[PDB]
From a paper:
Among type II receptors, TGFβR2 and AMHR2 only interact functionally with a select number of GFs, whereas [name], ACVR2B, and [name] are promiscuous and can form signaling and nonsignaling complexes with an overlapping group of over 30 GFs, including homodimeric and heterodimeric activins, inhibins, bone morphogenetic proteins (BMPs), growth and differentiation factors (GDFs), Nodal, and Lefty. At the most basic level, TGF-β pathways are activated when a dimeric GF forms a signaling complex with both receptor types, triggering a phosphorylation cascade from receptors to R-SMADs that results in R-SMAD–mediated transcriptional responses. Structural and biochemical studies have revealed that the GF-binding domain (GBD) of both type I and type II receptors adopt a similar, “three-finger toxin fold”, where the “fingers” refer to three pairs of antiparallel β-strands that form an extended β-sheet. We have solved the crystal structures of the type II [name] GBD in complex with activin B and of the type II activin Receptor [name] in complex with activin A. We show that [name] and activin type II receptors interact with GFs using a nearly identical mode of binding.
To determine how [name] and its GBD variants interact with GFs, we solved the crystal structure of [name]-GBD in complex with activin B, a GF that can bind [name] (28, 35) and that signals via [name] in some cell types. We solved the [name] complex by placing the activin B protomer structure predicted by AlphaFold first. The asymmetric unit of the [name] complex comprised three receptor and three GF protomers, where all biological dimers were related by crystallographic symmetry. [name] binds activin B at its “knuckle epitope”, a convex surface on the GF that is formed by a set of antiparallel β-strands or “fingers”. [name] adopts the three-finger toxin fold seen in other TGF-β family receptors with minor variations in β-strand length, flexibility, and orientation. Its GF-binding interface is similar to that of [name] and consists of a concave surface that harbors a hydrophobic hot spot containing three conserved aromatic residues, Y67, W85, and F115, at its center. By contrast, [name] exhibited significant variability in loop regions and in areas that were not directly involved contacting the GF, possibly reflecting the intermediate-binding affinity of [name] for activin B and the conformational plasticity of the GF-free [name] structures. In fact, loop conformations in the GF-free structure would preclude GF binding, supporting the idea that these loops adopt distinct conformations in the GF-free and GF-bound forms. We also observed a second, substantial interface, which results in the formation of a GF hexamer. Notably, type I receptors interact with the wrist helix at the GF dimer interface and this feature is occluded in the hexameric activin B complex.
Numbering used by the authors:
A (entry chain A): 293 to 339, 344 to 407
B (entry chain E): 31 to 41, 53 to 71, 75 to 102, 108 to 133
The structure:
Amino acid sequence: GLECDGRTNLCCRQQFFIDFRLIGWNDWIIAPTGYYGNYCEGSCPAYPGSASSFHTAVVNQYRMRGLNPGTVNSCCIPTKLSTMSMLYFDDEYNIVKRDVPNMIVEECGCA
Amino acid sequence: ERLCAFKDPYQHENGTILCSKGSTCYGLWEGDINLVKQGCWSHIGDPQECHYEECVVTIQNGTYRFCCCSTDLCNVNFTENFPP
């Protein structure tokens, strides 16, 4: 997968820090102070093996004639997710540690 | 897997814990400084926080001290050493 470097506009994984300080949540979440949740950005192909190449010829013929075929483009989406440990306040002021799943995007890819 | 100190008064026979593969150790202390929680910290993906040979502490009360560290049982004592 691609990592966003700020140069390419292809489907890439951009690093994104979520600061609990900015959103005012450091009062009930003790740790971490924040995390690199990241996200997916960039362009994808139109979305196989041998039959999909036939659809390729049909699409190219329709576009060549000024018609529009199935413009079902792919999407830049997370393909690999990791869990994150969190240490925070419970609603009764007890200290609860919970590993919250699917919190950090580690790879992006096209749907 | 790593072995970490453990303590949870919220719902340790000998004081060991089997962490999932790739986790680290953490510890939370609270006035007169006594321990509130210790165990496995599976938050990687932010090595700004969990790259330590020993437990290191860096709106909040200002009383709490949280660390995470990489070795076995390192979350038993912490240290602060900022340059003046």
